[PDB]
Design a protein around this ligand. Structure first.
Ligand SMILES: Cc1cc(C)cc(Nc2nccc(-c3c(-c4ccc(F)cc4)ncn3C3CCNCC3)n2)c1
Length: 127
């Protein structure tokens, strides 16, 4: 089935700010996860057309990915760190919902999620 448009990444009507926590989420968390050997399926929206997954967006109605998260952080789309953390969590949960436990893609997500959690544990205090 057709892909949906990717998630919104810029909103001129949405107020903006820079915080040490958002800067960390971009320069440490996103960067580190991006470079991980298992990152590639998570670096862009799931192309369900190319992958022949006609039911993907019947099941997943809140898609998310790290390509989108990168843009959101760049465009100061987020007011707070929790919005961004929520997007990462959504990204992983979608993968877990659509797939069978122990599947390759799930082991890949679990490793990335482990690393994510280790990094957010070291989220700096809001300065
Ligand atoms: C042949 C092959 C094998 C593997 C292991 C991966 C891929 N490529 C690829 N690219 C983007 C997505 C997925 C994917 C996802 C998925 C879901 C959510 C998310 F955030 C990230 C990924 N969930 C399932 N998949 C596929 C669907 C077809 N069967 C393999 C898993 N797979 C291609």
């Amino acid at each position: 089935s057709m892909n949906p448009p990717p998630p919104e990444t810029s909103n001129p009507n949405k107020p903006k700010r820079q915080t040490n926590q958002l800067q960390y989420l971009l320069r440490v968390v996103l960067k580190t996860l991006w470079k991980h050997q298992f990152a590639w399926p998570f670096q862009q929206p799931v192309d369900a057309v190319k992958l022949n997954l006609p039911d993907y967006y019947k099941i997943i109605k809140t898609p998310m990915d790290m390509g989108t998260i990168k843009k959101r952080l760049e465009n100061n789309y987020y007011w707070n760190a929790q919005e961004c953390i929520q997007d990462f969590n959504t990204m992983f949960t979608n993968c877990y919902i659509y797939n069978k436990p122990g599947d390759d893609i799930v082991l890949m997500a679990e490793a990335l999620e482990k690393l994510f959690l280790q990094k957010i544990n070291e989220l700096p205090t809001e300065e």
